[PDB]
Amino acid sequence: PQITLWKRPLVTIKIGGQLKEALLDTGADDTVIEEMSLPGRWKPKMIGGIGGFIKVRQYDQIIIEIAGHKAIGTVLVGPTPVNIIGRNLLTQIGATLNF
Amino acid sequence: PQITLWKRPLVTIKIGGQLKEALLDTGADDTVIEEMSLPGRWKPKMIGGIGGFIKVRQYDQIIIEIAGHKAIGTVLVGPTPVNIIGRNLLTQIGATLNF
Numbered sequence: 001p002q003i004t005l006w007k008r009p010l011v012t013i014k015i016g017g018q019l020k021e022a023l024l025d026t027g028a029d030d031t032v033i034e035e036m037s038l039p040g041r042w043k044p045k046m047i048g049g050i051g052g053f054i055k056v057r058q059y060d061q062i063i064i065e066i067a068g069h070k071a072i073g074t075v076l077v078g079p080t081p082v083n084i085i086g087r088n089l090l091t092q093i094g095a096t097l098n099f
Numbered sequence: 100p101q102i103t104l105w106k107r108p109l110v111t112i113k114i115g116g117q118l119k120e121a122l123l124d125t126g127a128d129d130t131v132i133e134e135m136s137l138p139g140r141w142k143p144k145m146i147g148g149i150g151g152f153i154k155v156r157q158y159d160q161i162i163i164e165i166a167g168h169k170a171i172g173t174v175l176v177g178p179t180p181v182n183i184i185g186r187n188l189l190t191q192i193g194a195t196l197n198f
């Protein structure tokens with residue numbers, strides 16, 4: 001699709017069989033989702049936002065659908081105020097910024 | 100241009116007679132620049148996200164050139180870790196997300 005930016009670029013994602021709303025974010029290096037259960041082992045990570053850094057759980061090779069596009073990759077889980085699809089998965093689904 | 104997302108989508112901007120590098124951020128409602136002087140009136144604002152909130156100065160009707168494209172809008176100035184071009188000015192340069 002071509003998504004303009006007059007409103008937030010929110011899409012539906014599916015992860016763990018569940019539908020969630022998330023933001024397509026070219027300013028995010030990684031994907032971070034609100035607290036949920038994911039399979040496997042996780043690794044520690046810090047990410048930085050407008051107000052400072054938070055600790056998150058890094059899950060690798062997680063199956064996730066983004067606006068109907070299937071992806072498999074790293075998902076961070078933690079106390080983010082909004083679900084964010086970052087560049088690691090935007091790149092995988094072929095997204096570019098155009099002007 | 101068409102910007103892929105393997106790396107951060109950083110571009111050069113001109114604001115307040117100064118050149119800066121800034122992040123094209125579809126996940127940002129607002130444009131936030133590191134501390135600098137701008138002409139005219141301003142009012143305080145709090146913006147919060149990952150990591151919490153920061154206090155900024157809101158300047159309205161500020162012209163910015165973004166990767167050679169002129170726009171005008173509100174610019175927030177404060178202790179952001181990164182200069183961010185948000186949706187309020189991305190729409191004005193006709194930026195879209197495409198996949």
Ligand SMILES: Cc1cccc(C)c1OCC(=O)N[C@@H](Cc1ccccc1)[C@@H](O)C[C@H](Cc1ccccc1)NC(=O)[C@H](C(C)C)N1CCCNC1=O
Pocket residue numbers: 025026027028029030031032047048049050051080081082084086124125126127128129130131146147148149180181183185
């Ligand atoms: C940078 C990065 C590394 C790894 C993983 C992730 C998710 C990363 O991105 C973290 C991050 O906060 N990125 C921001 C920009 C970023 C990159 C690097 C350092 C700091 C910031 C931005 O793009 C998304 C984030 C989303 C958001 C979160 C909570 C509430 C509302 C929105 N947006 C905002 O904070 C904006 C600010 C920028 C005006 N914002 C806050 C006021 C209300 N609305 C709004 O839009």
Ligand SMILES: [Cl-]
Pocket residue numbers: 072073074088089
């Ligand atoms: Cl990934």
Ligand SMILES: [Cl-]
Pocket residue numbers: 171172173187188
């Ligand atoms: Cl504006």
Ligand SMILES: [Cl-]
Pocket residue numbers: 004193
């Ligand atoms: Cl448009």
Ligand code: NA
Pocket residue numbers: 138139140158159160161
């Ligand atoms: Na003004």
